Amino acid sequence: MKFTRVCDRRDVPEGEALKVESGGTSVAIFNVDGELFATQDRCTHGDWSLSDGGYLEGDVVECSLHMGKFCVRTGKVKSPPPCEALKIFPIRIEDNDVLVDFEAGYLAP
């Protein structure tokens, strides 16, 4: 229902992440093999940025504070310490523009 233009698709190279924020909501955008995926930026186990850490392997991001891991496509936990999945956010690409609905974060089924 409410998409916000956050960056150019070329701002998130394959295998990298980018933090974007709006209204006090922080979202991490990951580029996995040419497609973009959005999740809450903070690890669910602490106030620690998943994008600012720099550890993405394929579609699994690793929190650099305690090594927890999450699937960026679904937000699901792949390794503890975390026990809670990340919220994921609607993300669309229109031309070279990447848009995110910061008010629609949700947990994957």
Using CB under 6 A, which of the segments 16-24, 27-35, 40-48, 85-93 binds ligand FES? 40-48
The rounded distance, in Å, linking the Cα atoms of 46 and 44 is: 6
Show binding-site residues: 43, 45, 63, 66
β strands within the chain, DSSP E: 4-8, 17-22, 25-32, 35-40, 56-57, 60-62, 69-71, 77-79, 91-94, 97-100
Least distance between ligand FES and beta carbon 82 (Å): 5
Query: Of 9, 19, 66, 73, which lies in the binding site for ligand FES, with binding defined by CB under 6 A?
Result: 66
In this complex, which beta carbon is closest to ligand FES, that of residue 9 or of residue 66?
A: 66
Q: Which residues bind ligand FES (CB under 6 A)?
A: 43, 45-46, 48, 63, 65-66, 68, 81-82
